[PDB]
C-alpha cells in the first residue's frame, strides 16, 4: 500500500524535509520536519514571526496536559515547551491514528527557519536520547505499539524545490535499483553506525579508523551537511583542495561561509573528487561502500546577485560530536531504517545524481579486517 506514501515529503534546499501531519480533534494540519537525529515530537504552539500556523491545544478535545516542561537542544537551534498528548495521523502515510507524546513549543532560539514551510519536528530515533529522559515514548515507538505498522521505515530524499518519500512500515522496491546493502545499528540511541574506511578518488585517507567514528557516527536526515570530526575534516579538505587546485577558491568557501559561482552550465564537476565511505557489513570481516559525487557535497544556492550563474556552498563541515551523514549524503540513496533487525540499508535511489562519467554507487562485498576496532569507546 506504499504507492500512497510516495512523494509525501517536500522541502527547500538546506532547510530540511517535511511530511504533512494532523494533531488533535478536529485535526489541525501541520508540516513536520523528519529528523532521524532526535527523538522528540514537537510542534510550534504559540505565535512566532516565522510560523504561518501552529498547534492550538485549546481547540483539541482530545488534548491531554502532562504538566511537565521540556527543553531540547540541537546542533543548531533549541526550544522549550510543554508536554502533553494528543491524537496524531499522517494523511499520506498509513491509515491509522495514534495517541502520541507532543511537546508544545512556547519559546525557541534559531529553531524555526524563515520560509521553511514547516512548523514542527518528528524525531525518529530511539527513546534513549528523548528529552527530558528516555521514559518519553517517541512517536514511532507509539505508532508501532498501537497499530500493526511494521517496525521500520525508509527515506528517499531527492535533491533539486526538493521532495522525496518516507515509506512508513516498509520498503517500496520501485524507489531504488540494484541491491540493498545493510550495516548494523551499533546502539539504539541515535542511528549509530561504524565507518571502517574512507577513500577520496580511490585513495585511502590512511587514518586510524577510530578517527572516522570519534566519538560516534550517525545517520541524520535533519542535518544538511556531511559533518566530520576535526582530524578527518582536515584530511578530507586537504585532499579535495589538491584535487581541485586547477581553480582557486576563497578560504571562506572551505568553511561553508562564502559561495562559489561559475557561468551557467560550466561547473567543473570533474575537478572535484568522489568520496567513498565504507560501512561495517552483516557478515564477518565484510563491509560495503557508498560513493558520494561532488553534486552532493556542493550544494546549489541562489545567486547572491542579479546574475544567471550556478552558485554552490561547500556542504562538508567540521564536527565536534562525531561524523554526521546528513541529508546531502542521504540524497540519491534509498535508506532503510530497519529497526526490527537493528540495521540500516542503503541502495542507489531512483532519484539518483547524474554525472556524465561518474555515478554514485553502493557496492560490495569488500573484505575488511578488525572492523570492531573502528568503534570508539
Ligand atoms: C548541542 C547539541 C546537543 C545534542 N543534541 C542532540 O543530539 C539532538 N539531536 C541533534 O542535534 C541532531 C544530531 C541534529 C538535528 O537533526 C538538528 C535538527 S534542527 C532542525 C533542522 C532543520 C533542517 S535545516 C538543516 C540545517 N542546515 C544548515 O544549518 O545548513 C548550513 C550548515 C548550510 C547553514 C542543519 O544542518 N541543521 C543541523 C546543524 C541541526 O542542528 N540539526 C537530540 C538528540 C537532543
Q: How far is CA 101 from the centre of its chain?
A: 22
Q: Which atom of ligand 1 is nearest to the CA of 129?
A: 44
CA 111 / ligand 1 centre spacing (Å): 9
Q: Burial of 267 by CB count in 10 Å (0-12 exposed, 13-18 middle, 19+ buried)?
A: buried
CA 286 / ligand 1 centre spacing (Å): 31
Do 38 and 181 fall within a single domain?
no
- Among protein residues, the one with the nearest Cα to ligand 1's atom 20 is 222
Cα–Cα distance for residue pair 153/166, rounded to 1 Å: 7
Of residues 178, 179, 71, the one with CA closest to residue 130: 71
Domain contains 2: no
Do 27 and 50 fall within a single domain?
yes
Do 281 and 299 fall within a single domain?
yes
Q: Burial of 29 by CB count in 10 Å (0-12 exposed, 13-18 middle, 19+ buried)?
A: exposed
Cα–Cα distance for residue pair 283/126, rounded to 1 Å: 25
Last residue within a domain, chosen from 149, 181, 202: 149
223 lines ligand 1 (CB under 6 A): yes
CB atoms within 10 A of CB 270: 14
Cα–Cα distance for residue pair 285/67, rounded to 1 Å: 50
14 lines ligand 1 (CB under 6 A): yes
Domain contains 8: no
76 lines ligand 1 (CB under 6 A): yes
Q: Which of 7, 35, 109, 373 is catalytic?
A: 35
Question: Is 208 among the residues known to form the active site?
Answer: no
Q: Which H/E stretch holds residue 17? A: strand 17-23
CA 74 / ligand 1 centre spacing (Å): 5
Taking only Cα atoms into account, the Rg of the chain, rounded to an integer number of angstroms, comes to 21
Q: Is the peptide bond before 365 cis (omega within 30 degrees of 0)?
A: yes
CA 283 / ligand 1 centre spacing (Å): 32
Question: Is 355 among the residues known to form the active site?
Answer: no
Domain contains 4: no
Do 375 and 302 fall within a single domain?
yes
Domain contains 5: no
The CA angle 63-64-68, to the nearest 5 degrees, is 130
User: Where is the chain discontinuous (C–N over 2.5 Å), named by the preceding residue?
Assistant: 160
Do 157 and 142 fall within a single domain?
no
40 lines ligand 1 (CB under 6 A): no
Do 288 and 236 fall within a single domain?
yes
The CATH number covering residue 307 comes to: 2.40.70.10
Last residue within a domain, chosen from 149, 172, 199: 149
Do 228 and 82 fall within a single domain?
no
Number of domains in the chain: 2
Cα–Cα distance for residue pair 132/130, rounded to 1 Å: 6
35 lines ligand 1 (CB under 6 A): yes
33 lines ligand 1 (CB under 6 A): yes
Cα–Cα distance for residue pair 249/258, rounded to 1 Å: 9
Q: Which H/E stretch holds residue 328? A: helix 327-330
Q: Which atom of ligand 1 is nearest to the CA of 222?
A: 16
Domain contains 202: yes
Query: Hunting for cell 497499530 — which residue is that?
Result: 147
Measured between alpha carbons, how far is residue 24 from residues 55, 100, 105, 249, 251 in Å?
9, 10, 15, 51, 50
- Written as nine digits, the cell of 113 is 527557519
CA 15 / ligand 1 centre spacing (Å): 10
Do 167 and 72 fall within a single domain?
no
Last residue within a domain, chosen from 110, 134, 149: 149
Measured between alpha carbons, how far is residue 304 from residues 13, 91, 265 in Å?
15, 37, 17
Half-sphere exposure in the Cβ direction for 1 (13 Å, CA): 8
Q: Burial of 45 by CB count in 10 Å (0-12 exposed, 13-18 middle, 19+ buried)?
A: buried
Which residues fall within 8 angstroms of residue 195, CB to CB, at 6 or more apart?
209, 212, 213, 217, 277, 278, 279, 280, 323, 374
The CA angle 228-231-236, to the nearest 5 degrees, is 65
Tell me if 169 sits within 8 A of 205, measured CB to CB: no
Cα–Cα distance for residue pair 353/317, rounded to 1 Å: 21
Do 160 and 85 fall within a single domain?
no
Do 360 and 341 fall within a single domain?
yes
Q: How far is CA 140 from the centre of its chain?
A: 16
221 lines ligand 1 (CB under 6 A): no
259 lines ligand 1 (CB under 6 A): no
Domain contains 12: no
Stated in angstroms to one decimal place, the resolution of this structure is: 2.1
Domain that holds residue 102: 17-149
Domain contains 198: yes
3-state helix, strand, coil in the chain (%, to 5): 15, 40, 40
Domain contains 1: no
Which residues fall within 8 angstroms of residue 98, CB to CB, at 6 or more apart?
87, 88, 89, 139, 142, 143, 146, 147
CA 245 / ligand 1 centre spacing (Å): 31
Q: Which one of 12, 38, 130 would you pick to mutate in the ligand 1 pocket, going by the greatest count of ligand atoms within 8 A of its CB?
A: 38
Do 246 and 350 fall within a single domain?
yes
192 lines ligand 1 (CB under 6 A): no
CA 34 / ligand 1 centre spacing (Å): 11
Alpha helices in 111-151 (DSSP H): 139-146
Do 175 and 143 fall within a single domain?
no
Q: Which method resolved this structure?
A: X-ray
Amino acid at each position: 500500500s506504499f504507492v500512497e506514501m510516495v512523494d509525501n515529503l517536500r522541502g527547500k534546499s538546506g532547510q530540511g524535509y517535511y511530511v504533512e501531519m494532523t494533531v488533535g480533534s478536529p485535526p489541525q494540519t501541520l508540516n513536520i520536519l523528519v529528523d532521524t537525529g532526535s527523538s522528540n515530537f514537537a510542534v510550534g504552539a504559540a505565535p512566532h514571526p516565522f510560523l504561518h500556523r501552529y498547534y492550538q491545544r485549546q481547540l483539541s478535545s482530545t488534548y491531554r496536559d502532562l504538566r511537565k516542561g521540556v527543553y531540547v537542544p540541537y546542533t543548531q537551534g533549541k526550544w522549550e515547551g510543554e508536554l502533553g498528548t494528543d491524537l496524531v495521523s499522517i494523511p499520506h502515510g498509513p491509515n491509522v491514528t495514534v495517541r502520541a507524546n507532543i511537546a508544545a513549543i512556547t519559546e525557541s532560539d534559531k529553531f524555526f527557519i524563515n520560509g521553511s514551510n514547516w512548523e514542527g519536528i518528528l524525531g525518529l530515533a530511539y527513546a534513549e536520547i528523548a528529552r527530558p529522559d528516555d521514559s518519553l515514548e517517541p512517536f514511532f515507538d507509539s505508532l508501532v505499539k498501537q497499530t500493526h505498522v511494521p517496525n521500520l521505515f525508509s527515506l528517499q530524499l531527492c535533491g533539486a524545490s526538493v521532495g522525496g518519500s518516507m515509506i512508513i512500515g516498509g520498503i517500496d522496491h520501485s524507489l531504488y535499483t540494484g541491491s540493498l546493502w545493510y550495516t548494523p545499528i551499533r546502539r539504539e540511541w541515535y542511528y549509530e553506525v561504524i565507518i571502517v574506511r574512507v577513500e577520496i578518488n580511490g585513495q585511502d585517507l590512511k587514518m586510524d579508523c577510530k578517527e572516522y567514528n570519534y566519538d560516534k557516527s550517525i545517520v541524520d536526515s535533519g542535518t544538511t551537511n556531511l559533518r566530520l570530526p576535526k582530524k578527518v575534516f582536515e584530511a578530507a579538505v586537504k585532499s579535495i583542495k589538491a584535487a581541485s587546485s586547477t581553480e582557486k577558491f576563497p578560504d571562506g568557501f572551505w568553511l561553508g561561509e562564502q559561495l562559489v559561482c561559475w557561468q551557467a552550465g560550466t561547473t567543473p564537476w570533474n575537478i572535484f573528487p568522489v568520496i567513498s565511505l565504507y560501512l561495517m557489513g552483516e557478515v564477518t570481516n565484510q563491509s560495503f561502500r557508498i560513493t558520494i559525487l561532488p553534486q552532493q557535497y556542493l550544494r546549489p544556492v541562489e545567486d547572491v546577485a542579479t546574475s544567471q550563474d550556478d552558485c554552490y556552498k561547500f556542504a562538508i563541515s567540521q564536527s565536534s560530536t562525531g561524523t554526521v551523514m546528513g541529508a546531502v549524503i542521504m540524497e540519491g540513496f534509498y535508506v532503510v531504517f530497519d529497526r526490527a533487525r537493528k540495521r540500516i540499508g542503503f541502495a542507489v535511489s531512483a532519484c539518483h545524481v547524474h554525472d556524465e562519467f561518474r555515478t554514485a554507487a553502493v557496492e560490495g562485498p569488500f573484505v575488511t579486517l578488525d572492523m570492531e576496532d573502528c568503534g570508539y569507546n
